[PDB]
Design an enzyme around this catalytic site. Structure first.
Site, PDB file in Angstrom:
ATOM      1  N   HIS A  68     -16.288 -33.847 -15.382  1.00 33.63           N
ATOM      2  CA  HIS A  68     -15.832 -34.645 -14.217  1.00 33.63           C
ATOM      3  C   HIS A  68     -15.216 -35.960 -14.707  1.00 33.63           C
ATOM      4  CE1 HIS A  68     -18.336 -31.744 -11.895  1.00 33.63           C
ATOM      5  NE2 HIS A  68     -17.318 -31.883 -11.042  1.00 33.63           N
ATOM      6  N   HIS A  72      -9.800 -34.009 -15.710  1.00 34.56           N
ATOM      7  CA  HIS A  72     -10.035 -33.166 -14.508  1.00 34.56           C
ATOM      8  C   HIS A  72      -9.176 -33.688 -13.350  1.00 34.56           C
ATOM      9  CE1 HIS A  72     -11.796 -30.934 -11.288  1.00 34.56           C
ATOM     10  NE2 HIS A  72     -12.327 -32.033 -10.759  1.00 34.56           N
ATOM     11  N   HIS A 106     -10.212 -37.778  -6.336  1.00 42.69           N
ATOM     12  CA  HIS A 106     -11.203 -36.945  -5.599  1.00 42.69           C
ATOM     13  C   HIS A 106     -12.560 -36.919  -6.310  1.00 42.69           C
ATOM     14  CE1 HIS A 106     -10.556 -33.665  -8.440  1.00 42.69           C
ATOM     15  NE2 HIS A 106     -11.659 -33.126  -7.933  1.00 42.69           N
ATOM     16  N   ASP A 107     -12.638 -37.247  -7.601  1.00 41.27           N
ATOM     17  CA  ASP A 107     -13.932 -37.291  -8.336  1.00 41.27           C
ATOM     18  C   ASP A 107     -14.176 -38.692  -8.918  1.00 41.27           C
ATOM     19  OD1 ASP A 107     -15.289 -34.875  -7.940  1.00 41.27           O
ATOM     20  OD2 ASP A 107     -14.198 -33.834  -9.560  1.00 41.27           O
ATOM     21  N   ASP A 217      -9.112 -27.936  -6.974  1.00 42.56           N
ATOM     22  CA  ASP A 217     -10.353 -28.437  -7.613  1.00 42.56           C
ATOM     23  C   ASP A 217     -10.930 -27.367  -8.546  1.00 42.56           C
ATOM     24  OD1 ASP A 217     -12.322 -30.303  -8.216  1.00 42.56           O
ATOM     25  OD2 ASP A 217     -13.495 -29.815  -6.417  1.00 42.56           O
ATOM     26  N   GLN A 269     -20.863 -16.322 -13.869  1.00 40.33           N
ATOM     27  CA  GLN A 269     -19.396 -16.538 -13.704  1.00 40.33           C
ATOM     28  C   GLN A 269     -18.783 -15.453 -12.809  1.00 40.33           C
ATOM     29  OE1 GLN A 269     -16.854 -19.063 -15.179  1.00 40.33           O
ATOM     30  NE2 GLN A 269     -18.823 -19.842 -14.488  1.00 40.33           N
TER      31      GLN A 269
HETATM   32  N1  LIG Z   1     -16.982 -29.053  -6.534  1.00 36.13           N
HETATM   33  C1  LIG Z   1     -17.135 -28.596  -7.570  1.00 36.13           C
HETATM   34  C2  LIG Z   1     -17.341 -28.024  -8.871  1.00 36.13           C
HETATM   35  C3  LIG Z   1     -18.341 -28.546  -9.690  1.00 36.13           C
HETATM   36  C4  LIG Z   1     -18.538 -28.006 -10.949  1.00 36.13           C
HETATM   37  C5  LIG Z   1     -17.734 -26.974 -11.391  1.00 36.13           C
HETATM   38  C6  LIG Z   1     -16.735 -26.441 -10.591  1.00 36.13           C
HETATM   39  N2  LIG Z   1     -15.940 -25.382 -11.091  1.00 36.13           N
HETATM   40  N3  LIG Z   1     -14.574 -25.451 -11.351  1.00 36.13           N
HETATM   41  C7  LIG Z   1     -14.171 -24.295 -11.810  1.00 36.13           C
HETATM   42  C8  LIG Z   1     -15.247 -23.432 -11.902  1.00 36.13           C
HETATM   43  C9  LIG Z   1     -16.351 -24.119 -11.461  1.00 36.13           C
HETATM   44  C10 LIG Z   1     -17.715 -23.575 -11.369  1.00 36.13           C
HETATM   45  N4  LIG Z   1     -18.462 -24.011 -10.401  1.00 36.13           N
HETATM   46  N5  LIG Z   1     -19.660 -23.602 -10.212  1.00 36.13           N
HETATM   47  C11 LIG Z   1     -20.327 -24.203  -9.133  1.00 36.13           C
HETATM   48  C12 LIG Z   1     -20.164 -25.560  -8.891  1.00 36.13           C
HETATM   49  C13 LIG Z   1     -20.812 -26.163  -7.827  1.00 36.13           C
HETATM   50  C14 LIG Z   1     -21.620 -25.412  -6.989  1.00 36.13           C
HETATM   51  C15 LIG Z   1     -21.769 -24.049  -7.216  1.00 36.13           C
HETATM   52  C16 LIG Z   1     -21.124 -23.449  -8.294  1.00 36.13           C
HETATM   53  O1  LIG Z   1     -21.418 -22.115  -8.326  1.00 36.13           O
HETATM   54  C17 LIG Z   1     -22.179 -21.814  -7.138  1.00 36.13           C
HETATM   55  F1  LIG Z   1     -21.464 -21.010  -6.244  1.00 36.13           F
HETATM   56  F2  LIG Z   1     -23.322 -21.122  -7.519  1.00 36.13           F
HETATM   57  O2  LIG Z   1     -22.488 -23.089  -6.546  1.00 36.13           O
HETATM   58  C18 LIG Z   1     -20.263 -22.678 -10.993  1.00 36.13           C
HETATM   59  C19 LIG Z   1     -19.604 -22.114 -12.044  1.00 36.13           C
HETATM   60  C20 LIG Z   1     -18.278 -22.544 -12.276  1.00 36.13           C
HETATM   61  O3  LIG Z   1     -17.633 -22.066 -13.188  1.00 36.13           O
HETATM   62  C21 LIG Z   1     -16.538 -26.969  -9.321  1.00 36.13           C
HETATM   63 MG   LIG Z   2     -16.169 -33.455  -6.789  1.00 38.65          MG
HETATM   64 ZN   LIG Z   3     -13.329 -32.072  -8.956  1.00 46.06          ZN
END
Ligand SMILES: N#Cc1cccc(-n2nccc2-c2nn(-c3cccc4c3OC(F)(F)O4)ccc2=O)c1
Ligand SMILES: [Mg+2]
Ligand SMILES: [Zn+2]
Ligand SMILES: [Cl-]
EC number: 3.1.4.17
Length: 313
Positions: A68, A72, A106-107, A217, A269
Protein backbone atom coordinates in the site's frame (compact mmCIF):
# COMPACT_ATOMS: atom_id res chain seq x y z
CA UNK A 1 1.28 25.84 -21.36
CA UNK A 2 3.30 24.37 -24.32
CA UNK A 3 5.43 22.17 -21.92
CA UNK A 4 4.12 18.71 -23.03
CA UNK A 5 5.52 15.79 -20.93
CA UNK A 6 7.07 13.04 -23.17
CA UNK A 7 8.09 9.42 -22.38
CA UNK A 8 10.65 7.12 -24.07
CA UNK A 9 9.29 5.28 -27.19
CA UNK A 10 8.61 1.98 -25.29
CA UNK A 11 6.63 3.68 -22.41
CA UNK A 12 4.84 6.12 -24.81
CA UNK A 13 3.23 3.02 -26.51
CA UNK A 14 2.95 0.46 -23.63
CA UNK A 15 1.37 3.09 -21.21
CA UNK A 16 -1.76 2.98 -23.49
CA UNK A 17 -2.18 -0.78 -22.66
CA UNK A 18 -4.07 -2.01 -19.54
CA UNK A 19 -1.17 -4.36 -18.49
CA UNK A 20 1.52 -1.58 -18.41
CA UNK A 21 3.93 -1.91 -15.42
CA UNK A 22 5.20 1.60 -14.38
CA UNK A 23 8.72 0.12 -13.69
CA UNK A 24 11.21 0.32 -10.76
CA UNK A 25 12.38 3.97 -11.36
CA UNK A 26 10.39 5.89 -8.66
CA UNK A 27 11.53 9.34 -9.95
CA UNK A 28 9.79 8.69 -13.36
CA UNK A 29 6.34 8.01 -11.72
CA UNK A 30 5.35 11.72 -11.26
CA UNK A 31 6.12 12.36 -14.99
CA UNK A 32 4.13 9.17 -15.87
CA UNK A 33 1.13 10.57 -13.88
CA UNK A 34 1.30 14.13 -15.43
CA UNK A 35 1.74 12.53 -18.90
CA UNK A 36 -1.52 10.55 -18.26
CA UNK A 37 -3.35 13.64 -16.83
CA UNK A 38 -2.29 15.82 -19.86
CA UNK A 39 -3.50 13.06 -22.31
CA UNK A 40 -6.65 12.00 -20.30
CA UNK A 41 -7.88 15.53 -19.30
CA UNK A 42 -5.67 18.16 -21.05
CA UNK A 43 -2.68 20.50 -20.31
CA UNK A 44 -5.10 23.28 -19.11
CA UNK A 45 -7.16 21.20 -16.57
CA UNK A 46 -4.48 21.92 -13.85
CA UNK A 47 -1.72 24.54 -13.25
CA UNK A 48 1.54 22.48 -13.69
CA UNK A 49 3.24 24.16 -10.64
CA UNK A 50 0.23 23.28 -8.36
CA UNK A 51 -0.23 19.73 -9.79
CA UNK A 52 3.53 18.99 -9.26
CA UNK A 53 3.34 20.32 -5.64
CA UNK A 54 0.11 18.26 -5.09
CA UNK A 55 1.73 15.02 -6.55
CA UNK A 56 4.88 15.39 -4.35
CA UNK A 57 2.80 16.07 -1.15
CA UNK A 58 0.62 12.96 -1.99
CA UNK A 59 3.88 10.95 -2.52
CA UNK A 60 5.22 12.22 0.87
CA UNK A 61 1.98 10.99 2.60
CA UNK A 62 2.20 7.39 1.28
CA UNK A 63 4.24 5.22 3.71
CA UNK A 64 7.19 2.85 2.95
CA UNK A 65 4.95 -0.27 3.36
CA UNK A 66 5.37 -3.44 1.22
CA UNK A 67 2.22 -3.02 -1.00
CA UNK A 68 0.00 0.00 0.00
CA UNK A 69 2.74 2.41 -1.21
CA UNK A 70 3.37 5.23 -3.76
CA UNK A 71 3.88 2.58 -6.54
CA UNK A 72 0.34 1.17 -5.86
CA UNK A 73 -1.18 4.72 -6.06
CA UNK A 74 0.44 5.43 -9.47
CA UNK A 75 -0.35 1.86 -10.76
CA UNK A 76 -4.11 2.29 -9.89
CA UNK A 77 -4.15 5.78 -11.56
CA UNK A 78 -2.67 4.14 -14.72
CA UNK A 79 -5.44 1.43 -14.86
CA UNK A 80 -8.03 4.30 -14.59
CA UNK A 81 -6.17 6.25 -17.36
CA UNK A 82 -6.44 3.10 -19.60
CA UNK A 83 -10.23 2.74 -18.85
CA UNK A 84 -10.89 6.52 -19.53
CA UNK A 85 -8.81 6.52 -22.79
CA UNK A 86 -10.68 3.39 -24.09
CA UNK A 87 -14.10 5.01 -23.10
CA UNK A 88 -13.39 8.59 -24.36
CA UNK A 89 -17.00 9.90 -24.86
CA UNK A 90 -18.65 8.27 -21.74
CA UNK A 91 -17.10 10.64 -19.10
CA UNK A 92 -17.60 14.38 -18.32
CA UNK A 93 -14.82 17.04 -17.90
CA UNK A 94 -14.91 16.90 -14.02
CA UNK A 95 -15.02 13.03 -14.02
CA UNK A 96 -11.74 12.68 -16.02
CA UNK A 97 -10.08 15.26 -13.62
CA UNK A 98 -11.50 13.77 -10.37
CA UNK A 99 -11.03 10.02 -11.08
CA UNK A 100 -7.20 10.11 -11.79
CA UNK A 101 -6.68 12.25 -8.60
CA UNK A 102 -9.06 9.90 -6.69
CA UNK A 103 -6.93 6.86 -7.77
CA UNK A 104 -3.59 8.58 -6.84
CA UNK A 105 -4.96 9.49 -3.33
CA UNK A 106 -7.23 6.43 -2.70
CA UNK A 107 -4.74 4.76 -0.24
CA UNK A 108 -3.23 7.98 1.30
CA UNK A 109 -1.40 7.32 4.65
CA UNK A 110 -2.11 3.53 4.56
CA UNK A 111 -0.30 1.70 7.44
CA UNK A 112 -0.50 -1.71 5.64
CA UNK A 113 -3.41 -2.88 7.89
CA UNK A 114 -7.10 -3.74 7.20
CA UNK A 115 -10.20 -1.98 8.70
CA UNK A 116 -10.71 -5.29 10.68
CA UNK A 117 -7.29 -4.93 12.43
CA UNK A 118 -7.86 -1.19 13.25
CA UNK A 119 -11.21 -2.23 14.89
CA UNK A 120 -9.76 -5.15 16.96
CA UNK A 121 -6.70 -3.04 18.00
CA UNK A 122 -9.18 -0.21 18.93
CA UNK A 123 -7.22 2.35 16.81
CA UNK A 124 -8.53 5.95 17.22
CA UNK A 125 -9.53 5.93 13.48
CA UNK A 126 -12.00 3.04 14.19
CA UNK A 127 -13.74 5.36 16.77
CA UNK A 128 -13.71 8.31 14.26
CA UNK A 129 -14.96 6.27 11.21
CA UNK A 130 -16.98 3.18 12.29
CA UNK A 131 -17.34 1.94 8.63
CA UNK A 132 -14.99 2.24 5.59
CA UNK A 133 -12.44 3.37 8.25
CA UNK A 134 -9.19 3.70 6.20
CA UNK A 135 -11.19 4.95 3.13
CA UNK A 136 -12.71 7.87 5.15
CA UNK A 137 -9.09 8.58 6.33
CA UNK A 138 -7.78 8.43 2.69
CA UNK A 139 -10.39 11.06 1.62
CA UNK A 140 -9.64 13.24 4.74
CA UNK A 141 -5.91 13.14 3.79
CA UNK A 142 -6.84 14.16 0.18
CA UNK A 143 -8.81 17.26 1.40
CA UNK A 144 -6.00 18.31 3.86
CA UNK A 145 -3.40 18.14 1.00
CA UNK A 146 -5.71 20.17 -1.36
CA UNK A 147 -5.90 22.83 1.45
CA UNK A 148 -2.06 23.17 1.80
CA UNK A 149 -0.93 26.60 0.43
CA UNK A 150 -0.51 26.49 -3.40
CA UNK A 151 -1.79 22.82 -3.54
CA UNK A 152 -5.42 23.50 -4.71
CA UNK A 153 -5.23 21.99 -8.27
CA UNK A 154 -9.05 22.70 -8.54
CA UNK A 155 -8.63 26.49 -7.77
CA UNK A 156 -10.14 27.58 -11.18
CA UNK A 157 -13.43 25.59 -10.62
CA UNK A 158 -16.69 27.36 -9.54
CA UNK A 159 -18.14 26.60 -6.01
CA UNK A 160 -20.51 24.22 -7.95
CA UNK A 161 -17.82 22.36 -10.02
CA UNK A 162 -15.44 22.19 -6.95
CA UNK A 163 -18.19 20.54 -4.78
CA UNK A 164 -19.00 18.21 -7.75
CA UNK A 165 -15.31 17.10 -8.18
CA UNK A 166 -14.78 16.61 -4.36
CA UNK A 167 -18.04 14.53 -4.27
CA UNK A 168 -16.85 12.32 -7.24
CA UNK A 169 -13.48 11.81 -5.43
CA UNK A 170 -15.15 10.99 -2.02
CA UNK A 171 -17.50 8.36 -3.58
CA UNK A 172 -14.59 6.96 -5.70
CA UNK A 173 -12.31 6.57 -2.61
CA UNK A 174 -15.09 5.11 -0.37
CA UNK A 175 -15.91 2.60 -3.19
CA UNK A 176 -12.33 1.13 -2.80
CA UNK A 177 -13.64 -0.43 0.50
CA UNK A 178 -13.92 -4.07 -0.77
CA UNK A 179 -16.70 -4.74 1.85
CA UNK A 180 -18.88 -2.35 -0.30
CA UNK A 181 -17.78 -3.92 -3.67
CA UNK A 182 -19.94 -7.13 -3.33
CA UNK A 183 -23.32 -5.31 -3.04
CA UNK A 184 -22.36 -2.69 -5.67
CA UNK A 185 -21.54 -5.42 -8.27
CA UNK A 186 -24.78 -7.39 -7.48
CA UNK A 187 -26.90 -4.20 -8.02
CA UNK A 188 -24.97 -3.40 -11.28
CA UNK A 189 -25.43 -7.05 -12.49
CA UNK A 190 -29.23 -6.93 -11.72
CA UNK A 191 -29.59 -3.41 -13.30
CA UNK A 192 -27.58 -4.48 -16.41
CA UNK A 193 -29.78 -7.64 -16.92
CA UNK A 194 -33.25 -5.97 -16.29
CA UNK A 195 -32.16 -3.08 -18.63
CA UNK A 196 -32.65 -0.43 -15.85
CA UNK A 197 -28.96 0.71 -16.10
CA UNK A 198 -29.12 4.43 -17.11
CA UNK A 199 -25.81 6.44 -17.18
CA UNK A 200 -27.95 9.66 -16.92
CA UNK A 201 -29.11 8.44 -13.46
CA UNK A 202 -26.30 9.93 -11.25
CA UNK A 203 -27.03 7.13 -8.68
CA UNK A 204 -26.18 4.65 -11.54
CA UNK A 205 -23.03 6.59 -12.72
CA UNK A 206 -21.82 6.43 -9.05
CA UNK A 207 -22.19 2.58 -8.99
CA UNK A 208 -20.32 2.21 -12.36
CA UNK A 209 -17.57 4.58 -11.05
CA UNK A 210 -17.35 2.47 -7.82
CA UNK A 211 -16.90 -0.70 -9.94
CA UNK A 212 -14.21 1.05 -12.06
CA UNK A 213 -12.46 1.93 -8.74
CA UNK A 214 -12.59 -1.77 -7.63
CA UNK A 215 -11.28 -2.80 -11.13
CA UNK A 216 -8.35 -0.27 -11.00
CA UNK A 217 -7.60 -1.04 -7.31
CA UNK A 218 -7.34 -4.85 -8.00
CA UNK A 219 -5.48 -4.41 -11.37
CA UNK A 220 -2.28 -6.27 -10.15
CA UNK A 221 -4.29 -9.48 -11.10
CA UNK A 222 -4.56 -8.14 -14.76
CA UNK A 223 -0.76 -7.75 -15.29
CA UNK A 224 1.51 -10.24 -17.11
CA UNK A 225 2.07 -13.31 -14.86
CA UNK A 226 5.59 -12.37 -13.60
CA UNK A 227 4.30 -8.90 -12.43
CA UNK A 228 1.15 -10.49 -10.86
CA UNK A 229 3.22 -13.24 -9.14
CA UNK A 230 5.85 -10.74 -7.78
CA UNK A 231 3.15 -8.24 -6.56
CA UNK A 232 1.51 -11.22 -4.69
CA UNK A 233 4.75 -11.44 -2.56
CA UNK A 234 4.26 -7.75 -1.47
CA UNK A 235 0.46 -8.20 -0.89
CA UNK A 236 1.11 -11.28 1.36
CA UNK A 237 4.04 -9.43 3.07
CA UNK A 238 1.40 -7.00 4.51
CA UNK A 239 -1.19 -9.80 5.20
CA UNK A 240 1.37 -11.84 7.24
CA UNK A 241 2.52 -8.73 9.21
CA UNK A 242 -1.21 -8.17 10.07
CA UNK A 243 -1.63 -11.86 11.10
CA UNK A 244 1.45 -11.46 13.37
CA UNK A 245 -0.25 -8.37 14.93
CA UNK A 246 -3.55 -10.35 15.32
CA UNK A 247 -1.53 -13.04 17.25
CA UNK A 248 -0.03 -10.22 19.43
CA UNK A 249 -3.68 -9.29 20.37
CA UNK A 250 -4.17 -13.03 21.30
CA UNK A 251 -6.36 -13.58 18.14
CA UNK A 252 -5.57 -16.44 15.66
CA UNK A 253 -5.72 -14.73 12.23
CA UNK A 254 -7.71 -16.10 9.21
CA UNK A 255 -5.53 -18.45 7.07
CA UNK A 256 -4.97 -15.68 4.40
CA UNK A 257 -2.96 -13.64 7.03
CA UNK A 258 -1.24 -16.67 8.76
CA UNK A 259 2.39 -17.04 7.51
CA UNK A 260 2.36 -20.67 8.88
CA UNK A 261 -0.36 -21.39 6.22
CA UNK A 262 1.89 -20.23 3.29
CA UNK A 263 1.11 -23.54 1.44
CA UNK A 264 -2.61 -22.43 1.19
CA UNK A 265 -1.84 -19.15 -0.79
CA UNK A 266 -2.46 -20.58 -4.33
CA UNK A 267 -5.95 -21.91 -3.33
CA UNK A 268 -6.64 -18.65 -1.38
CA UNK A 269 -5.81 -16.87 -4.73
CA UNK A 270 -8.28 -19.07 -6.73
CA UNK A 271 -11.03 -18.03 -4.23
CA UNK A 272 -10.13 -14.30 -4.63
CA UNK A 273 -10.08 -14.53 -8.49
CA UNK A 274 -13.41 -16.50 -8.59
CA UNK A 275 -15.25 -14.61 -5.75
CA UNK A 276 -13.83 -11.04 -6.33
CA UNK A 277 -11.63 -10.36 -9.41
CA UNK A 278 -13.33 -12.29 -12.30
CA UNK A 279 -16.89 -11.14 -11.30
CA UNK A 280 -15.52 -7.53 -11.09
CA UNK A 281 -13.92 -7.52 -14.60
CA UNK A 282 -16.92 -9.59 -15.98
CA UNK A 283 -19.54 -6.95 -14.91
CA UNK A 284 -17.14 -4.09 -15.96
CA UNK A 285 -16.75 -5.65 -19.49
CA UNK A 286 -20.62 -5.79 -19.71
CA UNK A 287 -21.06 -2.03 -18.90
CA UNK A 288 -17.79 -0.88 -20.62
CA UNK A 289 -17.01 -3.31 -23.49
CA UNK A 290 -13.57 -1.77 -24.32
CA UNK A 291 -12.23 -2.85 -20.80
CA UNK A 292 -12.39 -6.56 -21.98
CA UNK A 293 -8.54 -6.84 -21.94
CA UNK A 294 -8.65 -6.60 -18.06
CA UNK A 295 -11.04 -9.64 -17.86
CA UNK A 296 -8.92 -11.62 -20.41
CA UNK A 297 -5.63 -10.92 -18.50
CA UNK A 298 -7.37 -11.82 -15.17
CA UNK A 299 -8.55 -15.24 -16.51
CA UNK A 300 -4.96 -15.78 -17.85
CA UNK A 301 -3.68 -15.23 -14.25
CA UNK A 302 -6.46 -17.52 -12.83
CA UNK A 303 -5.07 -20.26 -15.20
CA UNK A 304 -1.44 -19.60 -14.00
CA UNK A 305 -2.51 -20.02 -10.29
CA UNK A 306 -4.32 -23.30 -11.22
CA UNK A 307 -1.04 -24.36 -12.99
CA UNK A 308 0.75 -23.51 -9.64
CA UNK A 309 -1.63 -25.91 -7.72
CA UNK A 310 -1.19 -28.72 -10.37
CA UNK A 311 2.65 -28.42 -9.83
CA UNK A 312 3.10 -27.00 -13.42
CA UNK A 313 4.66 -23.92 -11.63
N1 LIG B 1 -9.00 -3.09 -1.03
C1 LIG B 1 -8.15 -3.84 -1.15
C2 LIG B 1 -7.08 -4.79 -1.28
C3 LIG B 1 -6.23 -5.01 -0.20
C4 LIG B 1 -5.19 -5.92 -0.32
C5 LIG B 1 -4.99 -6.58 -1.52
C6 LIG B 1 -5.82 -6.37 -2.61
N2 LIG B 1 -5.57 -7.07 -3.81
N3 LIG B 1 -5.19 -6.49 -5.02
C7 LIG B 1 -5.04 -7.44 -5.91
C8 LIG B 1 -5.28 -8.67 -5.33
C9 LIG B 1 -5.60 -8.43 -4.02
C10 LIG B 1 -5.95 -9.47 -3.03
N4 LIG B 1 -6.82 -9.14 -2.12
N5 LIG B 1 -7.21 -9.96 -1.21
C11 LIG B 1 -8.13 -9.43 -0.30
C12 LIG B 1 -7.97 -8.13 0.17
C13 LIG B 1 -8.88 -7.59 1.07
C14 LIG B 1 -9.95 -8.34 1.50
C15 LIG B 1 -10.13 -9.64 1.03
C16 LIG B 1 -9.21 -10.18 0.13
O1 LIG B 1 -9.57 -11.45 -0.19
C17 LIG B 1 -10.86 -11.70 0.42
F1 LIG B 1 -11.88 -11.82 -0.53
F2 LIG B 1 -10.78 -12.90 1.12
O2 LIG B 1 -11.10 -10.58 1.29
C18 LIG B 1 -6.77 -11.23 -1.12
C19 LIG B 1 -5.87 -11.73 -2.01
C20 LIG B 1 -5.42 -10.85 -3.02
O3 LIG B 1 -4.62 -11.24 -3.85
C21 LIG B 1 -6.87 -5.47 -2.49
MG1 LIG C 1 -7.47 0.95 0.16
ZN1 LIG D 1 -5.55 0.39 -3.11
CL1 LIG E 1 -6.44 10.99 -26.74
Amino acid sequence: GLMQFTLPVRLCKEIELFHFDIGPFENMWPGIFVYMVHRSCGTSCFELEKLCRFIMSVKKNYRRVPYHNWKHAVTVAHCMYAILQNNHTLFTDLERKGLLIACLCHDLDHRGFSNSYLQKFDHPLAALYSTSTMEQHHFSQTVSILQLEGHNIFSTLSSSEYEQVLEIIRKAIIATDLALYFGNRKQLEEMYQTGSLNLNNQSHRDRVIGLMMTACDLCSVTKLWPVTKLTANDIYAEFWAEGDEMKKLGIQPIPMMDRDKKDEVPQGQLGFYNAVAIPCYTTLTQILPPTEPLLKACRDNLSQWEKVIRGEE
